[PDB]
């Protein structure tokens, strides 16, 4: 039994500092959006432990550490590689690892132990126009599985009272949250959302 | 097989009424909007009896009455207080009973003739931002569900020929309804749900 | 088990050409925007004959020809009827044919080889409001069922750079597509909405 | 046999960063520029190894992980807390670990093993005026110690074409750098110095 948690996200602050550290990038390393993301989740996991978890048999498992089965689509099919100790990561760890990992699923193979659903599955359509949002299943070693939907620049109030409401557009991914709903609940569910949301808004605390 | 009903709905109307009724509040009660959103669902569900119905074994149990299983979360969890005969009751009576039932929850407990799913259950996370949408599971005992996301302000055109279109920022919440979908079905269900915004947007309908 | 893959869509163009082609209807026929969207869903289909498939117990049966199972909502339920290869049909073949099935189910009844989810299983509700989006269950014959939520128009940049972002509001309809997520995949899903999204955004294409 | 590597450094951007996240600290912690810092020469001796390193009879023990000993002044004389995996750390964990290492050294102690000279000996007067620099003894289980003095706000050319070179007055540490010689050399030493250097003058890279 899954619930559904839908959540918009600016990302226009993250878009600007990756573009400026894609610039500080000296071809050493390519950081993707996502990688931020990954070291992001990373943060609101450990911030939010029932998120990086497990359905065990009996129990559920919480793992302290985060590590993140981000999702590559693959010819084969979705090779979820394992990206490890996120939160103790670098983020250009992140960054060559999840080029790295998606590189050996599509081109090669991962080994097996690339593929473990690790605390938090990860499924990114950020890329995928025309799906602004999308829903998939939980991993039943998950706790809860994360989809995101594409960016989308809309009409947004500008503070400025000239143009007192004005129109003012933003970036931002709204995204599904398909929890498995018995090692993880809405209430909780939503607030790994907004600690994902808080952190990844401003990248200055996903800095730290 | 639950099937889902998604509707934005605004409030700016009934968020009006409900300041001018909570200035006319003489510190005897306190009007949430979810107080006239259970009086409306009340409404509503005399208004489309097949929501405030139940799954018996063999046929659906259509109920005359509608009470509301509101859903209080609780650190014990999810109670869900049943409020009775609302579309007879107040909405004062609705205030009180609707504090006063979570209070229970949270601080004591309720005796277990509170949580019925009683002919409706109600999730409301209007007032937990980054979920402007959520989908929960239906009752057994229910016939359908509905989750409410939070309010947002958007860019609404502005009948003024001035500013022709122009940008007028309504708040509204867009709310999920998970469906049972043999007992409640699509038609009657976004049916439902547009008697509830209907009576919603306008309390003046919901005044009587 | 079943993924959602959400998608929103313009129609002000192909409005358009309906609304001119419903004037270069002579009464002969009723060109519903549904038509071109049948037609279009079978281009998609051959397109993406993922879709236009079938569960079958041990493998997936992809259909060659795309038909569609429309479903009309009837007294009785929800009748499906079939509008066997759209693909190579008229589109006023596809407006009588729509019409004239959702009369036979409403009115009479369809014959029992109008049913069969064929290929493609297609709930429409865009002429249903307070349903901008809903979710239905995949039929076990069928690969993928498509649910269409309602029309709304929306703040959207224009171009003009003296109102530089501007607000210029379009009709669009975002749409669910529940998929069965093992005869269809998620990646496949959304190129084959992408597909109808490009057919249909433009109806030049959808001439052919 | 030591040599001093003698290093500005300016911090007007680390201080607005300190100052937006003290805002942006809820109470929670009290992040001081020592903390920063802390992360920081975590960052350039995970960068240049051979600062986290101790001399050993024999050999020089290159440590990958680094701590630091941050040396607080006591009542007592020096203690020097060791905080652990910082580059792994937090910084609020720095926050925190820093002043209750120094609260527990001078108001009570710190057990032995807080005492370690880990990998990197830092002492701090960047608070004490009068000394803009100063220089200290490297530990014998240390590979180098580093000494700030205090921050002096300084003429600078300002790149305005207007006022061309112009007069800007800009905030920065000038730091001493004592160093063993045999375990770490001028040339590392002065290199591990600018990576310190380029990680806090922006904490954007800090960051991460």
């Known amino acids: 039994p899954h619930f559904f948690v839908t959540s918009e996200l600016s990302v226009s602050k993250l878009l600007k500092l990756r573009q ?18 990954i070291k992001a989740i990373a943060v609101a996991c450990k911030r939010v432990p029932a998120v990086n978890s497990s359905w065990r048999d009996g129990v559920i498992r919480q793992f302290d550490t985060v590590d993140v089965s981000v999702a590559v689509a693959t010819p084969t099919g979705l090779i979820t590689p394992i990206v490890k100790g996120v939160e103790a990561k670098g983020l250009e760890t992140i960054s060559a690892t999840v080029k790295e990992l998606a590189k050996k699923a ?26 602004e949002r999308f829903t998939a299943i939980i991993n039943p070693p998950q706790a809860a599985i994360l989809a ?31 929890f498995d709903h018995k090692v993880v609940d809405g209430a909780v569910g939503a607030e790994w959302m907004r600690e994902l949301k808080k952190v990844v808004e401003n990248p200055l605390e996903l800095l730290l």
């Open 20 to 37: 400026a550290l894609n610039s500080s990038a000296e071809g050493r390393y390519k950081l993707s959006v996502n990688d931020f993301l």
């Open 148 to 178: 995101v939907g594409t960016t989308k620049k809309v009409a947004v109030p500008v503070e400025n009272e000239d143009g007192t409401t004005g129109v003012e557009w933003d970036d931002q991914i709204v995204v599904t949250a398909s």
């Open 106 to 131: 599509r081109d090669g193979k991962l080994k097996p132990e690339d593929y473990q659903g690790g605390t938090i599955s990860i499924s990114n359509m950020g890329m995928n126009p025309a799906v």
